Structure formats: C-alpha cells, structure tokens
Curated annotation (Swiss-Prot):
It catalyses: N(6),N(6),N(6)-trimethyl-L-lysyl(9)-[histone H3] + 2 2-oxoglutarate + 2 O2 = N(6)-methyl-L-lysyl(9)-[histone H3] + 2 formaldehyde + 2 succinate + 2 CO2. GO terms for biological process: cellular response to ionizing radiation; chromatin remodeling; double-strand break repair via homologous recombination; inflammatory response; positive regulation of chromatin binding; positive regulation of double-strand break repair via nonhomologous end joining; regulation of gene expression; regulation of protein phosphorylation. Ubiquitinated via 'Lys-63'-linked ubiquitin chains. Deubiquitinated by USP14 with the help of TRIM14 leading to stabilization. The chain holds residues 11 to 341 of 523 of the full protein. The modification PolyADP-ribosyl glutamic acid is found at E16, E17. It is found in: Nucleus. This is Lysine-specific demethylase 4D. GO terms for cellular component: blood microparticle; chromatin; nucleoplasm; nucleus; pericentric heterochromatin; site of double-strand break. Fe cation binds at H182, E184, H270. Belongs to the JHDM3 histone demethylase family. Binds 1 Fe(2+) ion per subunit. Keywords: ADP-ribosylation, Chromatin regulator, Dioxygenase, Iron, Metal-binding, Nucleus, Oxidoreductase, Transcription, Transcription regulation, Ubl conjugation, Zinc. The keyword Oxidoreductase applies. Its EC number is 1.14.11.66.
Amino acid sequence: AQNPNCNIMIFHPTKEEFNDFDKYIAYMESQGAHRAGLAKIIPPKEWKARETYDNISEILIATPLQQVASGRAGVFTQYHKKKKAMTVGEYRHLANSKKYQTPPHQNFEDLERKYWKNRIYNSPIYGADISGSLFDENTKQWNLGHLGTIQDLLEKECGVVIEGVNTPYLYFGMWKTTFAWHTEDMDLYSINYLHLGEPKTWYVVPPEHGQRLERLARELFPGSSRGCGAFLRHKVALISPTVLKENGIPFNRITQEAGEFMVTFPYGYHAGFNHGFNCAEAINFATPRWIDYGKMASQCSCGEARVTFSMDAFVRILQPERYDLWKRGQD
Ligand SMILES: O=C(O)CNC(=O)C(=O)O
Ligand SMILES: [Mg+2]
Ligand code: NI
Ligand SMILES: [Zn+2]
C-alpha cells in the first residue's frame, strides 16, 4: 500500500507531464497521494498562469465578509457579517492597513503560533466565492477554467445526461482570514492555485480517518450537532492543531506559497488561514474514483448549508433516497 502513513506529498511535474491533467491526478494517486487528503503540485519552471497581475485592482468584491469568532482560542465558530462592496484595490489597501496587516514574525511557525493564540480577538474581512478566473486564455496546462466538467464525468461514467455547470471562484484574503473544517460539496475534489501574495496554511485529516474528526466535532460543538447531523457542511467550525493532537486526531499541515497548486481529495477534511493579502482561484472536479464517494457523501438538510444550482442533479442521481429531504432544506 503506497503512503501508508498518509503524509502530504509534493510533486514536481515536468513540462511534458503537465499536459494531461487527468493523467497526472491518476499518477499522484498511484503513489498514494490521496491518502493524505491533500497534495502540493509545483508547476514546471517553464509554466506561467498569466503574464502579470498588474491589472487586477478593478475586480469587484460585491459582498466582502467580516469573519467574527465566538468560543475559545482553540475551539471556535465564525459567522460572516456582510460588508459594503469594494474593489480589489480598496481591499488590498485595507489588508495592508495597521488594523489588518500581518504582524512582525520570525518564520511561518511563529506566525502559526500567533494565529492560534490571537485569531478570535480580531475580525478579518474575506473576499470569497467570487465567480471568475485569472488564468490567461492562452494558458493551456492546468488552467482551472478549462477543466473537464463534473457533469461530463458523471455522464461518461454513468451514462446520464444532467443540467449544470462548473466554473472557478476567486478568493481575496488577508491576515487571519479563515477557512473552516469541511469536505467539498458531494465530497468532490478541489484544486486551488495561489495566484499572488502571501501564503496560505492548510490543515488536513486523511480520508480514512474523517469520521474521527466528525466525532470530535460533535463533542466540541454539541448544540450545533443536535441542530444538524452534518453540521460541518455549514463551514463555521474551527479546531486548532493543539486540540486535534490532545484528542488523538490524525492530521497534517503544509504551507502553500504563490505559484503553487493544492489538490484536496474526496472526503479529505481541511481548514486553514491566510498569512496576509493574497488571491487564490479554486474549482471542484471529479474523476472516476470520486463516484463512490459521491454516493456516500453526507448531506445537510437543516437549511443552513445552502449550495449551488448544480448540486441538485448530483443528489438526484447519486442519492435518490435522500433527494426529497435534502431538497426541502434547499427550499
Ligand atoms: O482558499 C480558501 O479560502 C478555501 N479553499 C478551499 O477550501 C479549497 O480550495 O478547497
Ligand atoms: Mg482590474
Ligand atoms: Ni475546500
Ligand atoms: Zn445543516
């Protein structure tokens, strides 16, 4: 069995290996990368996502979100307070202001310590889930807006033809902006490219051990667990590495830098934070190996999780018994 310890693997494809996306995902899996839940891909030196970023300040963040925490430093939830629209240029200046800028620090480890100690006492502002792409149309390799669609994968594997589309999203972050513990919708893969700026730290639980994280989360957030049997789908709960280690939950951590891809694998729980002003692009995707995870994915039916148009068909085809209840929570 490859990668039995479930370590995060890092890959350095050559330019030739970077041509066929599906092939290279299958290669990483042959080496056991999926067992970690997360992999890093460093693009060949000959590759570029676009020529420059000198022209991005005019993008609009229609609904910036202020991430307000409740709880204790290691175990907290966050809610999103909507803020007035701002451009990327406005947001970058905000990020770099004295109130929001990254503090002085020695190294990534010192910054991680400061994050876990102090995050709850501040409310950073995140530009999330902005439909769009920063890949140049002429970039042919690993262009996140030109991937094979999940609808097409389900059609090829299962023969059924469904509605829905699959497009990328932009994320603009600052110091302390936070992604809560989650798996993807329908336990899909994700791929994330850090276009520019300061790093993103990731934490991940191996897919084979995801239910250990779920059990701890029910213990730590007991009212939330009573409200919903899949409340991690709400994407609001944070648990620190120190708390995970205290409770024996297997996990790994890694820091992504600008110019690097991360792939999350089906049912790989992940969480993290941004080090300072940055811009990432991400999208969900599927492979044949996903289909069994899609069929077994938990679902939120309490109303809170509310998701895209395209998840309807996934539930309807893969999970017909659950469909009527889930759709009630959509409506
Ligand atoms: O970058 C973020 O804020 C969160 N991204 C992801 O959860 C991802 O790519 O799957
Ligand atoms: Mg612009
Ligand atoms: Ni994710
Ligand atoms: Zn719910």
